[PDB]
C-alpha cells in the first residue's frame, strides 16, 4: 500500500 | 512535473529466477532516468544511473534499459538479499521526481512457526499493566493465526500483533501477538493461551502458562 | 570515505519549525551540492531542494515560501530548516549528495532522520524483560527479549549485547496503541546451554526523550 515510516518498507 | 508509475505495485519470485521492474513516464524523458534499492531500515541505493550504467559496487546481475517513456530494472538471478523495495527517478525536467516504487517479495519453500510465550514480568505488573507476548518465530508464508483464551474465554480486541519483513537470508517472517490487560483483569483469571495455526502445522500448537 | 550524517528524530509541534543538521565528512562542501530529499506515506519519495558548492539554493517549487538551507563550509554542515509544519509533513528526511558536483543521481545519502508532526508530548519507553522458560525452549534453544512499551513519537533503535549480538535478532516494528504510544518487542532465539554463561542485554535508546536502557534479561526464579 503505502510507504512505512516505521520499517522504512512499502505495505501490503 | 514529470510523473513516473511503476508496474506492478509488488512482485513476488522464487529464487535464482529473473526479475524486472517497470518504470514508464508520462513524457519522453531520453535515458535520464536513476534506479534505487531500499532494504528494511536502510536509506536509497544507488543501482543504475542514466537508465544503463553501472555503479561502483553494485552486483552484476543488476542491469537497465529503457528510452523514451519505458525504461526497465532487471536482476537476472534473484538472490534472497535482493528483498527490498525499488525506486526509479527521472531527471531530464526539473524538478527531479521519483516513482511510488515496486515492492520485491521473495518465495520459498513453507516453514512453519516455533511458537513461545512470555508471562508478564513481575516489574511490569508493578506498572498496574500485564502484557502477555506470544512469539511464532522463522515461518513462511505470512499468514497465520493467532488465537487468545483466558481461562476458556476467547480474547478479542485486546491484542495486537506485528510482523518483521521477510528475512534478507532465509525468507522467512517473525510474528508478535501481545495481549494487553489491567493487573486487576490478570490477577483474577489462571490460565493464559495462545493457539497457533499456520499451513505448515498439521494441527494447532497451544502455547500456555498458569498465573504463578 | 564519502559519509553524511544527520541530526537525531524528534517531535516538531503543529505549525513550528524544523531543523537538521547533515555533518559530512569526505568531500569538501565547497566541491559538491548537497540535496535534501524526504520520504513519507503519502508522496513517497520527494525531492525538497539543494544548497550548491557556491552557496546558491534551489527549491521545489511547493516548498519554496518555507525551506531554507544554509552551510558552514569550514565545519562541513549543512543546515536544513522548514517552516510552519502540518501532519503530513511528518516523514523522513535525508541529505544526499550526488556522483559529480553538479548532477542529481544519490550515489551518498544520510541515515534520515525521522521526523513526526504532532500537538503530542513526548515521552521515553519503559523496558521489561521478556524472559526465557521452559516455555520459551525447544531443541536446545531458548527465546528471550526485551518489551519496550508506551513511547512517543518513533523511532526506537534496538540492539543486544552492545552489538556484538545480531543472529536471531527480530526487532518489530511497533504498534500504535488506543494511548497514542507506541510499544514494541525485540527478541532473540540463544542456544539454551548459554543462559548460565553468557549476559543478555537489550540496549534500548529512545533519541526523541533522551532516553537510554540497557535491560538485563535473565531465566525467572
Known amino acids: 500500500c503505502q510507504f512505512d515510516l516505521s520499517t522504512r518498507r512499502l505495505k501490503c | 512535473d514529470i510523473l513516473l508509475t511503476q508496474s506492478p505495485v509488488i512482485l513476488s519470485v522464487s529464487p535464482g529466477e529473473r526479475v524486472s521492474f517497470s518504470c514508464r513516464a508520462s513524457?519522453?524523458?531520453?535515458?535520464?532516468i536513476h534506479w534505487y534499492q531500499q532494504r528494511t531500515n536502510g536509506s536509497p541505493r544507488l543501482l543504475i544511473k542514466y537508465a544503463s550504467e553501472s555503479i561502483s559496487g553494485i552486483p552484476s546481475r543488476f542491469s537497465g534499459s529503457g528510452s523514451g517513456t519505458d525504461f526497465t530494472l532487471s536482476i537476472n538471478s534473484v538472490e534472497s538479499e535482493d528483498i527490498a523495495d525499488y525506486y526509479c527517478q527521472q531527471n531530464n525536467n526539473w524538478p527531479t521526481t521519483f516513482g511510488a516504487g515496486t515492492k520485491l517479495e521473495l518465495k520459498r519453500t513453507v516453514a512453519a512457526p516455533s511458537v513461545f510465550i512470555f508471562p508478564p514480568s513481575d516489574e511490569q505488573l508493578k506498572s498496574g499493566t500485564a502484557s502477555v507476548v506470544c512469539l511464532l518465530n522463522n515461518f513462511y508464508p505470512r499468514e497465520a493465526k493467532v488465537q487468545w483464551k483466558v481461562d476458556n474465554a476467547l480474547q478479542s480486541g485486546n491484542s495486537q500483533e506485528s510482523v518483521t519483513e521477510q528475512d534478507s537470508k532465509d525468507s522467512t517472517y517473525s510474528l508478535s501477538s501481545t495481549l494487553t490487560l489491567s493487573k486487576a483483569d490478570y490477577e483474577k483469571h489462571k490460565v493464559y493461551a495462545c493457539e497457533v495455526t499456520h499451513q505448515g502445522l498439521s494441527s494447532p500448537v497451544t502455547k500456555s502458562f498458569n498465573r504463578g | 570515505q564519502v559519509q553524511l550524517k544527520q541530526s537525531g528524530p524528534g517531535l516538531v509541534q503543529p505549525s513550528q519549525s524544523l531543523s537538521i543538521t547533515c555533518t559530512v565528512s569526505?568531500?569538501?562542501?565547497?566541491?559538491?551540492?548537497v540535496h535534501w530529499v524526504r520520504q513519507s506515506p503519502g508522496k513517497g519519495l520527494e525531492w525538497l531542494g539543494v544548497?550548491?558548492?557556491?552557496?546558491?539554493?534551489d527549491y521545489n517549487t511547493p516548498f519554496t515560501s518555507r525551506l531554507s538551507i544554509n552551510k558552514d563550509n569550514s565545519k562541513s554542515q549543512v543546515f536544513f530548516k522548514m517552516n510552519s509544519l502540518q501532519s503530513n509533513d511528518t516523514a523522513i528526511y535525508y541529505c544526499?549528495?550526488?556522483?559529480?558536483?553538479?548532477?542529481?543521481?544519490?550515489?551518498?545519502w544520510g541515515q534520515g532522520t525521522l521526523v513526526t508532526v504532532s500537538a503530542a508530548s513526548t515521552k521515553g519507553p519503559s523496558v521489561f524483560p521478556l524472559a526465557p522458560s521452559s516455555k520459551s525452549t525447544s531443541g536446545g534453544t531458548a527465546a528471550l527479549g526485551c518489551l519496550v512499551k508506551d513511547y512517543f513519537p518513533e523511532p526506537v533503535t534496538v540492539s543486544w549485547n552492545s552489538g556484538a549480538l545480531t543472529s536471531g535478532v527480530h526487532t518489530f516494528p511497533a504498534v500504535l496503541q488506543s494511548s497514542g504510544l507506541y510499544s514494541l518487542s525485540s527478541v532473540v532465539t540463544v542456544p539454551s546451554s548459554s543462559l548460565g554463561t553468557q549476559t543478555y542485554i537489550c540496549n534500548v535508546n529512545h533519541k526523541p526523550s533522551n532516553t537510554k536502557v540497557d535491560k538485563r534479561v535473565e531465566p525467572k526464579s
Open positions: 544548497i550548491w558548492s557556491g552557496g546558491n539554493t
Open positions: 544526499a549528495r550526488a556522483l559529480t558536483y553538479y548532477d542529481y543521481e544519490f550515489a551518498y
Open positions: 513524457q519522453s524523458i531520453g535515458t535520464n
Open positions: 569526505g568531500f569538501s562542501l565547497t566541491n559538491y551540492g
